[PDB]
A paper describes a structure:
The TGF-β ligands are dimers and initiate signal transduction by forming a signalling complex with two copies of a type I receptor and two copies of a type II receptor; all are single-pass transmembrane proteins containing a small extracellular ligand-binding domain (ECD) and an intracellular kinase domain (ICD). Upon signalling complex formation, the constitutively active type II receptor phosphorylates and activates the type I receptor; subsequently the type I receptor phosphorylates Smad1/5 or Smad2/3 to regulate transcriptional responses. Of note, [name] is particularly highly expressed in lung vascular endothelial cells, where it mediates the signalling from circulating BMP9 and [name].
We solved crystal structures of the [name] binary complex with [name] in two different crystal forms, at 1.48 Å and 2.4 Å, respectively. In the 2.4 Å structure, there is only one copy each of [name] and [name] monomers in an asymmetric unit. The dimeric receptor complex can be generated with a symmetry-related molecule. Using the chain identities to name the seven complexes, they are complexes AC and BD, complex AB and complexes AI, BJ, CK and DL from the ternary complexes. Interestingly, 5 out of 15 residues with alternate conformations in complex AC are at this area, suggesting that the conformation in this region is highly flexible. Consistent with this observation, in complex BD and complex AB, the F3-loop region makes different interactions with [name] but both involve [name] residue D338 and are near [name] residue S107. Of note, these interactions are present in all three [name]:[name] 1:1 complexes from the binary complexes, but not in those from the ternary complexes. In contrast, in the free ligand form, or in the complex with ALK1 (but no prodomain), BMP9 and 10 preferentially adopt the extended conformation. ENG-bound BMP9 is closer to the prodomain-bound form, whereas [name]-bound [name] (in the absence of ALK1) mostly adopts an intermediate conformation.
Residue numbers in the entry:
A (entry chain A), B (entry chain A): 321 to 424
C (entry chain B), D (entry chain B): 26 to 37, 51 to 133
Amino acid sequence: NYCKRTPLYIDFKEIGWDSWIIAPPGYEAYECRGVCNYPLAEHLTPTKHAIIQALVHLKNSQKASKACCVPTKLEPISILYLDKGVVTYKFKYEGMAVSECGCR
Amino acid sequence: NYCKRTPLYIDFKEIGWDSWIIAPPGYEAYECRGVCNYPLAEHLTPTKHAIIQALVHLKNSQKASKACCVPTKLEPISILYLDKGVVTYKFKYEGMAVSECGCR
Amino acid sequence: GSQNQERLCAFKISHENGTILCSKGSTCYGLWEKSKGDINLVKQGCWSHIGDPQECHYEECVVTTTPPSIQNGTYRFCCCSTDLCNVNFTENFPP
Amino acid sequence: GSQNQERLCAFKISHENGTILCSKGSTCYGLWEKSKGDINLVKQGCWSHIGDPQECHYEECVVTTTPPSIQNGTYRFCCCSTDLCNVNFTENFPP
C-alpha cells in the first residue's frame, strides 16, 4: 500500500552478530514499505528532487523511476559490544531504528 | 546494475511548470538507479539500518526488503520563478540536483 | 513514574550514590560475567526504550536469552522496568 | 579564468560598479521583459553551474527557448559562458 513504517525485528543471534554484540538480544528496527504516489504527501517529507522525479515517472515510466520509500529519520539504540576484547557501552548507537519514513 | 548516479534531464516546459518557473528551461537533475547488494560498499555511505536490513533480506527475502538506491546528497540550482506576479531569484534553490547516490 | 516515563536505576543527569535517572522511558540494565561461583558486575545504568528490546519489559532483571558464546558464555545481561531492578539478576536460560 | 572556473558578469563577493564575480564555474545570466519596442532589464548576475542547464553553454547571451507563456510571453532569459556576455541579448526562438 502507501509508504509507511512497518515492523522489522532484528535478532542478533540469528543474523550472526552476537559474536560481538553482547546486548541486546535484539530490537525493533522497523522498515519502510509502500509505494510513493504522486503527489507525495507532506508527512513523507519529499525533497524537491523526489517530487520532480515522481512527476517525470508518471509521464514516462521509462525516463525516471518512482520515488523510493526509505527511512528518513533514524534513531539510536543502546548497545553493549566487544572491541578487541573490551566491553563498550553506548547509550545511543546512531542510525539503528526507524522513527519516520518518507519518499526520496 | 549497481547503485550509481544516472542521467535525468528535466524540461520545465514539458512537465508543465514553465507557468511559474521562468528560468532555466531545464537542468540535469540526475537520478539513482541500481541494486543495493550486500555488503553495501562504502561509497554508498550505508547507514547502520540499511546494512542490517540488507542482511535480513539476504537471509529471508520476505522478512525485509533490499536497501533502496536513492539520492543521499542533493545540490541547489539557480532559479527564476513567479510568486504572485513577483519575479524571485534564488542562486541556490535547495534539493534539486543529485551529486551522490547511496543505499538507505 | 510511568506518566513522565522516568525511572531510577542502579549505577556502578548525575550518577550520584550508585544510582542514575533514566528518562524518556529508558529502563534499567546490568551486565555481569559469571563462571561457576565467580560473579562480577561489569556495568549498570540506563537502556534506551528506542528499539523496544523484548526482555526489557520484565519487572525483574532476568537473563532470559542464552548468553553469547563470547568469553566462554560468561556474560549475563538483563534489563527491566521497575526502579532499582538491576541491583541483582536471576537466570532463565533456554538451555 | 577557465582553470579556476571564475567569470565576470554584469550586475544591475561584491557587486561593485555593475559587475559581479561568478565562481565555481557559474555563468552569467540576464532576464529582460520585451513587448514590441519596450525592453526592460529585470535582473543580472550569476547562474550556478549545478544542474548544467543547456543554453548556458553559449558564449553569447542568446534566448534560444520559446519564452514562457506568463506575462504575455514577454520574458527574455539567457545565460552564457564568456565574461560580461549578459550585457545584452540576442533572440533565436523556435517560433
